[PDB]
């Protein structure tokens, strides 16, 4: 798992029995802005009397878990994070996944300090987050989330761990349960309108539940006017589906289903509930194994009233497998992130052809042997999942989940033989999409299943309207036939280091070298700078800050094979051919003639230059060579392709036969990592 | 001459409606926050010269 | 215990209000401080070097420097400042060729003449002499790669091994 904010659990817990007492949190303040901004802000009346008390302080017997970490522990506090909370309640039905999120062995009595940890699925990686045990309490009792018995604390700390990843408590205000589910599972969220069930919906619930998937539901809201429905059902409110059973009550077979209300109080009325002599009509044998009689917000209802009353039903499966199917499949995963940014990459959907073509694009190879004829249709099954990163943390500024969705195009068979394969503005004006997301919706993730013939396809993710800023990532799940996979692409480069000798050099260059060098004969570092500025003030396109001297020196101490201070002919001829191509790429990739490389463009420029990097890495290059608007001017571009063409070059050759590994002592480690 | 150097850098219908939709985020209404807990929420109980200082 | 409270109290007033320090902001800061100290020769800190300072110091990778990051950086700059004026013995406002080995050793660093020369080739002006902003920019990344190395010398042997990833990660930072 990746360590969130790069803090470690076991290097904190160690650092107490050597430091003193109980531990605060630099990463995540217990100061009055680790809470809210507006509606629960630093001084909206609402916020006051509130105190960060540890479990030791408001509870003689501070426990972590007691009577298992079960679903009766989770009970909503003063915040609208039912969505997430419902998610937690249904998590505890699987024991051994709860494991992953909750390291159950924590205490207050062992080698303890005040720090805690949880693991979370986050936009494609598993991430472990640490918090301190201090929690928001007012008066005696707890305020946000709280247990059944009031000296159990795990579920409240988890809540705090989920706010930390989201900036603050108030940000957790509202969303979908599947946001929670996936953040616990990394699973595949299938949805269902309860107006339009598929046939075996009821049998799906049972499969799902058996299959250890995650389930939850909710009645939606319509504009204009009050909350609670008079059968006692909370409107616009996350509930957690928990039990699936069909049992013949004297007369007819009964479809029944167990839900849980995250309040932990207020169960539904009128029909089939808890204090209802319809339970007279059922056999005691499986009855006294399945139905209780106490208010915990948990209850049953007919599948009929369940269909009548609930609007939405979200489900999270721990595989891309569908539950309509009854057999397990093999699946490859392909991950890719990107950004929309107004001006360069924020395109809108196809409804806006003037911009649409400036979103990022993504290849999708559906391959011959992965074809099946299943379900009548013949093709390759796959799943696209587009998901907004970190949207919940821009809630401070006011913003929220955009309206997202995607479209798929068939690359024409004449591009088939190509890497640089980008799709034109006019291309989208002459070609309908081949497949596409259901709609565009303002969910955090939109993901559907597809089946197309083997071939190459472009994936175009977008908001509905252009000019919307935001980051995303994509999960593509391929169905595969078990005779491959375990195959993992890796960081590779591709030099083109040729053209030594006079034969390959030219008499033009030969003659023109003589000119520019002047007296000192080899071209100095200060000389190459004069050159770079000239071109910089010649080329109309090619935005640049200017080429610094610290960079030119670097260019010499790269092609300075013989060793001397400066650049001789062959040495310079190579340098030029290299700047020539860095330029051809920059040109060819700069399809909006900004004269600059945006995120996506960079990724494509690096690829055209031979490098093959993981997302983590592209994302470092960007974060390091890019200005605030997330863009790279020509000089940074060269600096970047230079540095990298060196790092790789230095790796190979220090590792000639491809032991994926290399070894360095201190002094020379400095001398590579800082210079030559 | 330098001019001559720089020259070496490269010589000189159908609509397809996409429909959208809007889904209300859950629990963004205060009517959804517990009664027992709604209770609690009311009630009630120069710039850079100090850096210069570090040099001399 | 005491100076921190009265230090943090005003890290904020220039952190902006995303609470973290930007490369542009870091620039702005520094250039504001040198002009008040004209006895340290410099052409000023350019954006690109403030980017890498933030890069190598950023370490929770929030892309910007929070308190413990900013504090650490500053504390070093301040150490290296006194080291500048001290080992600048001809009062030029630059560390010259011969002054260099003195100061770096003094900054805890231990090199050969070979390394020193090349440093001087890459970071010094024409005459061998070396600016202030350059001297700082330089020590920041010596300090980085030195801790990074440390952070892997678990064998204590003064000898670490890394793979393609790690290599790039730790060096795509200059
Ligand atoms: Ca329990
Ligand atoms: Ca009940
Ligand atoms: Ca010359
Ligand atoms: Ca630049
Ligand atoms: Ca040479
Ligand atoms: Ca561009
Ligand atoms: Ca800032
Ligand atoms: Ca930081
Ligand atoms: Ca001097
Ligand atoms: Ca300088």
Curated annotation (Swiss-Prot), chain A:
EC number per UniProt: 3.4.22.53
Linker, as annotated region: 490-504
Major localization listed first in the record, in broad terms: cytoplasm
Documented effect of changing residue 395 to A: Decreases catalytic activity
Keywords in alphabetical order: Acetylation, Calcium, Cell membrane, Cytoplasm, Hydrolase, Membrane, Metal-binding, Protease, Repeat, Thiol protease
Annotated Ca(2+) 5 binding sites: 517, 520, 522, 527
Any Gene Ontology biological process: protein catabolic process
Regulation: Activated by 200-1000 micromolar concentrations of calcium and inhibited by calpastatin.
Domain EF-hand: 547-580, 577-612, 642-675
Molecular function in Gene Ontology: calcium ion binding; calcium-dependent cysteine-type endopeptidase activity; cytoskeletal protein binding; enzyme binding; peptidase activity; protein-containing complex binding
Tissue distribution: Ubiquitous.
Record flagged with keyword Calcium: yes
Family as reported in the entry's similarity comment: Belongs to the peptidase C2 family.
Function: Calcium-regulated non-lysosomal thiol-protease which catalyze limited proteolysis of substrates involved in cytoskeletal remodeling and signal transduction. Proteolytically cleaves MYOC at 'Arg-226'. Proteolytically cleaves CPEB3 following neuronal stimulation which abolishes CPEB3 translational repressor activity, leading to translation of CPEB3 target mRNAs.
Quaternary state and interactors: Forms a heterodimer with a small (regulatory) subunit (CAPNS1). Interacts with CPEB3; this leads to cleavage of CPEB3.
Protein name in the entry: Calpain-2 catalytic subunit
Native species: Rattus norvegicus (Rat)
Classification of source organism: Eukaryota, Metazoa, Chordata, Craniata, Vertebrata
Swiss-Prot record, chain B:
Inhibitory domain repeats: 13-45
Function: Specific inhibition of calpain (calcium-dependent cysteine protease). Plays a key role in postmortem tenderization of meat and have been proposed to be involved in muscle protein degradation in living tissue.
Domains as described in the record: Each of the four flexible inhibitory domains can inhibit one calcium-bound calpain molecule by occupying both sides of the active site.
Family classification: Belongs to the protease inhibitor I27 (calpastatin) family.
Protein name according to UniProt: Calpastatin
Species name: Rattus norvegicus
Species classification: Eukaryota, Metazoa, Chordata, Craniata, Vertebrata
The gene coding this protein: Cast
Residue span relative to the full protein: 194 to 278 of 713
UniProtKB/Swiss-Prot annotation, chain C:
Entry GO CC: calpain complex; cytoplasm; cytosol; membrane; plasma membrane
Positions with a binding annotation for Ca(2+) 4: 43, 131
Subcellular location, record wording: Cytoplasm; Cell membrane
Modification type N6-acetyllysine: residues: 85
Binding site for Ca(2+) 2: 58, 60, 62, 64, 69
Binding site for Ca(2+) 3: 88, 90, 92, 94, 99
Biological process terms in GO annotation: protein catabolic process; proteolysis
Keywords: Acetylation, Calcium, Cell membrane, Cytoplasm, Membrane, Metal-binding, Phosphoprotein, Repeat
An example molecular function term from Gene Ontology annotations: calcium ion binding
Binding site for Ca(2+) 1: 15, 18, 20, 25
Residues forming coiled coils: none
Domain of life: Eukaryota
Residues in EF-hand domain copies: 2-36, 45-78, 75-110, 111-139, 140-174
Subunit annotation: Homodimer or heterodimer of a large (catalytic) and a small (regulatory) subunit. In presence of calcium, the heterodimer dissociates.
Functional description taken from the UniProt entry: Regulatory subunit of the calcium-regulated non-lysosomal thiol-protease which catalyzes limited proteolysis of substrates involved in cytoskeletal remodeling and signal transduction. Essential for embryonic development.
Domain notes per entry: The contact of the 5th EF-hand domain from each monomer allows the formation of the homodimer and also appears to mediate the contact between the large catalytic subunit and small regulatory subunit for the formation of the heterodimer.
Protein name: Calpain small subunit 1
Organism: Rattus norvegicus
UniProt gene name: Capns1
């Amino acid at each position: 798992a990746i360590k969130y904010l790069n803090q470690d659990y076991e290097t904190l817990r160690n650092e107490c029995l050597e430091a003193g007492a109980l531990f605060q949190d630099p990463s995540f303040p217990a100061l009055p802005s680790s809470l809210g901004f507006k509606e629960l802000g630093p001084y909206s009346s609402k916020t006051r009397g509130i105190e960060w008390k540890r479990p030791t302080e408001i509870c003689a017997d501070p426990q972590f878990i007691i009577g298992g970490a079960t679903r009766t522990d989770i009970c909503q506090g003063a915040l609208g994070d039912s969505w997430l909370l419902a998610a937690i309640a249904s998590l505890t039905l699987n024991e051994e996944i709860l494991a992953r999120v909750v390291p159950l062995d924590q205490s207050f009595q062992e080698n303890y300090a005040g720090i805690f940890h949880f693991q979370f699925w986050q936009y494609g990686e598993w991430v472990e987050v640490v918090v301190d045990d201090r929690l928001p309490t007012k008066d005696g009792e707890l305020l946000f989330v709280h247990s059944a018995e009031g000296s159990e604390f795990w579920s409240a700390l988890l809540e705090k761990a989920y706010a930390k990843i989201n900036g603050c408590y108030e940000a957790l205000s509202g969303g979908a349960t599947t946001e929670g589910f996936e953040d616990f599972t990394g699973g595949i969220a299938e949805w269902y309108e309860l107006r339009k069930p598929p046939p075996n919906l009821f049998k799906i619930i049972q499969k799902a539940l058996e299959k250890g998937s995650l389930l939850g539901c909710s009645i939606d809201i319509t504009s204009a006017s009050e909350a609670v429905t008079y059968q006692k059902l909370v409107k616009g409110h996350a509930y957690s589906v928990t039990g699936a059973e069909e049992v013949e009550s004297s007369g007819s077979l009964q479809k029944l289903i167990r839900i849980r209300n995250p309040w932990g109080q207020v169960e539904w009325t009128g029909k089939w509930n808890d204090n209802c002599p319809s339970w007279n009509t059922v056999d005691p044998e499986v009855r006294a194994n399945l139905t209780e009689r106490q208010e915990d917000g948990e209850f049953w209802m007919s599948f009929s009233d369940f269909l009548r009353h609930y609007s939405r039903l979200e489900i999270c499966n721990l595989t891309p497998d569908t539950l309509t199917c009854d057999s397990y499949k093999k699946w490859k995963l392909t991950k890719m992130d990107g950004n929309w940014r107004r001006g360069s990459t924020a395109g809108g959907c196809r409804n806006y052809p003037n911009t649409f073509w400036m979103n990022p694009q993504y290849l999708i190879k559906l391959e011959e042997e992965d074809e099946d004829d299943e379900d009548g249709e013949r093709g390759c099954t796959f799943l696209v999942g587009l998901i907004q990163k970190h949207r919940r943390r821009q809630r401070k500024m006011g913003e929220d989940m955009h309206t997202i969705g995607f479209g798929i195009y068939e690359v024409p068979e004449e591009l088939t033989g190509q890497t640089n394969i980008h799709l034109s503005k006019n291309f989208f004006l002459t070609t309908r999409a081949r497949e596409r997301s259901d709609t565009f919706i303002n969910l955090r993730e939109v993901l559907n299943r597809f089946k197309l013939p083997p071939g190459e396809y472009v994936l175009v993710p977008s908001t509905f309207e252009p000019h919307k800023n935001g980051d995303f990532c994509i999960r593509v799940f391929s169905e595969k036939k078990a005779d491959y996979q375990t195959v993992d692409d890796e960081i590779e480069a591709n030099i083109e280091e040729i053209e030594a000798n006079e034969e390959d050099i030219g008499d033009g260059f030969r003659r023109l070298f003589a000119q520019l060098a002047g007296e000192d004969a080899e071209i100095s570092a200060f000389e190459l700078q004069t050159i770079l500025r000239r071109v910089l003030a010649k080329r109309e396109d090619i935005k640049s800050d200017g080429f610094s001297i610290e960079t030119c020196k670097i260019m010499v101490d790269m092609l300075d094979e013989d060793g001397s201070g400066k650049l001789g002919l062959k040495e310079f001829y190579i340098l030029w051919t290299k700047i020539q191509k860095y330029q051809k790429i920059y040109r060819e990739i700069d399809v909006d003639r900004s004269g600059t490389m945006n995120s996506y463009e960079m990724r494509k420029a690096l690829e055209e230059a031979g490098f093959k990097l993981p997302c983590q890495l592209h994302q470092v290059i960007v974060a390091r060579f890019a200005d605030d608007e997330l863009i790279i001017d020509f000089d940074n571009f060269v600096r970047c392709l230079v540095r990298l063409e060196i790092l790789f070059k230095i790796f190979k050759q220090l590792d000639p036969e491809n032991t994926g590994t290399i070894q360095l002592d201190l002094i020379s480690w400095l001398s590579f990592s800082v210079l030559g | 001459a330098l001019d001559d150097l720089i020259d070496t850098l490269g010589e000189c219908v159908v609509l397809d409606p996409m429909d959208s939709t809007y889904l209300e985020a859950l629990g963004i209404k205060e009517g959804t926050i517990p009664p027992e807990y709604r209770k609690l929420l009311e009630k009630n109980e120069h710039a850079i010269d100090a850096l210069s200082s570090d040099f001399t | 215990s005491e100076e921190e409270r009265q230090f943090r109290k005003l890290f904020v007033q220039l952190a902006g209000d995303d609470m973290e320090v930007s490369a542009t902001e870091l620039m702005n800061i520094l250039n504001k401080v040198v002009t008040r100290h004209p006895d340290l020769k410099t052409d000023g800190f350019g954006i690109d070097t403030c980017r890498s300072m933030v890069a190598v110091m950023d370490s929770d990778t929030t892309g910007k420097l929070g308190f413990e990051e900013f504090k650490y950086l500053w504390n070093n700059i301040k150490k290296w400042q006194g080291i500048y004026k001290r080992f600048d013995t001809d009062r030029s406002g630059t560390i010259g060729s011969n002054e260099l080995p003195g100061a770096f050793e003094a900054a805890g660093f231990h090199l050969n003449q070979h390394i020193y020369s090349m440093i001087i080739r890459r970071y010094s002006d024409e005459t061998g002499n070396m600016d202030f902003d350059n001297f700082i920019s330089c020590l920041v990344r010596l300090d980085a790669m030195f801790r990074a190395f440390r952070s892997l010398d678990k064998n204590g042997t003064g000898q670490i091994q890394v793979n393609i990833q790690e290599w790039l990660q730790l060096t795509m930072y200059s």
